[PDB]
Amino acid sequence: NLPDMDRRCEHPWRDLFLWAILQNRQEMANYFWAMGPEAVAAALVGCKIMKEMAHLATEAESARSMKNAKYEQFAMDLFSECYSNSEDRAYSLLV
């Protein structure tokens, strides 16, 4: 079921962002998100995964960092920029 081990990823930035997010590395995850093709969906997925891991976090420092992921803030800011730009392509982007 696994793909070809030598075949390059179809969505490299998506996989890198997902990988960096599963391990609470936020600075790196942020850099990967800044390079991904679809940023609003990536930010929402990131915030979902962060708030999901916040419960499973053992260390208090890691849980505190996870609760302040502010990945939803990135999505809101980028969508505010998009809405200010077009306001007609923004709806198509949403839907």
Binding stretches for its own copies (CB under 8 A): 59-61, 83-84, 87
CB of 59 to its own copies, least distance (A): 6
56 burial level (CB within 10 Å; 0-12, 13-18, 19+) = exposed
Using the minimum distance from each CB to its own copies, give the nearer residue, 15 or 77.
Answer: 77
29 burial level (CB within 10 Å; 0-12, 13-18, 19+) = buried
**Token pair belonging to 58:** 């053992």
CB of 69 to its own copies, least distance (A): 18
Using the minimum distance from each CB to its own copies, give the nearer residue, 27 or 88.
Answer: 88
CB of 78 to its own copies, least distance (A): 16
CA 13 to chain centre: 10
Using the minimum distance from each CB to its own copies, give the nearer residue, 40 or 90.
Answer: 90
